Target: Surface layer protein
Amino acid sequence: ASGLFITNEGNFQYSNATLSYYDPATCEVENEVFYRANGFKLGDVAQSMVIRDGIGWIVVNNSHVIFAIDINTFKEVGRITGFTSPRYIHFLSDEKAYVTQIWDYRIFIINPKTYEITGYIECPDMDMESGSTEQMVQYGKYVYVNCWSYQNRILKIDTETDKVVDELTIGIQPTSLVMDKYNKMWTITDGGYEGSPYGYEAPSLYRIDAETFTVEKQFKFKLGDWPSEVQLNGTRDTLYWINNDIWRMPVEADRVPVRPFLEFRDTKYYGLTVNPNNGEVYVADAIDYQQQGIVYRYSPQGKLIDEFYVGIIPGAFCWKL
Ligand code: CNC
Model:
């Protein structure tokens, strides 16, 4: 039945990441489900999760590993190890996926059927000390990928030859990437932070044409803002993001909204997803990055349906639908 996984990053360098699973039919959450099923822990900084063909792939960023689990029993069915610091996985086929990385200038290519690393894509003008590749979207035979930490680019990869073929420089630290129904990509930058070795600026939300790879809109926010996490609804025509509050806007808009979907409440909204079938909006709140976090489930009109405690620093969601 429909279900929602929530990955909890835990505290970096403390190895307290966990996996939660929520059943929206019964409004019940189960926490530490990977430990319950397997009798050992995920590790440090569970970062993201994708489901393909009955198998969930959980990226554990600071444990150099992706685990593959059966999505019904939560039992490990396999794992791939040896990643520098993995971020997101994107499948091109049953036998090929890309795994992006921080602290590396390469994207790793894997064969998910054999649980092996099978190649690398070298990113131009990037090194190990400050390299970063992050989220991916596909456009025909191309994958576009944002480069987040200490970077300011989207790259374009030809998936036939596994080569970076183009790049676009924007504001510092684009955090996330989605593709709307008009084949326009959206990304939102975090603007760095005060005292950053790389930079600190007002962040922006950008709309980029996938066909020509050119900026079509830039909406600039305020210095001090630290936004993240563009997300779309299932029809890919309403964009959501975090910038203190949760914001949303029609992808056709020429102006940013004046009223948020969910007002800032002096906590730490940190993760976000929209149910692709019914439009319900889930917001993961890290609270203060120390206590158990909470997820809020809202109707499409912003009415709270349910709320539930998860693990520490819930950061990402994956639908089982
Ligand atoms: C808030 C936060 C977080 N950050 Co920073 C982010 N985004 N971060 C920050 C901020 C901290 C300042 C502040 N006080 O607000 C801020 C914006 C400066 C920051 C900066 C960075 N962060 C960075 C990264 C990548 C990370 N950060 C996280 C730790 C990441 C956290 C997410 C997570 N899962 O932990 C995070 C969301 C929450 C940390 C926290 O407050 N914990 C509660 C606190 C009480 O516990 P703590 O143990 O004392 O936490 C401290 C450390 O985590 C330290 N710290 C924070 N980030 C880093 C990154 C590194 C490499 C190191 C060594 C330490 C830190 O700052 C915290 C307060 O002192 C991270 C796990 C987020 C993720 N990717 O999921 C990730 C580390 C991943 C990895 N290395 O494998 C940056 C490299 C990003 C960038 N390019 O801007 C940069 C590095 C700074 C550095 N120290 O070298």
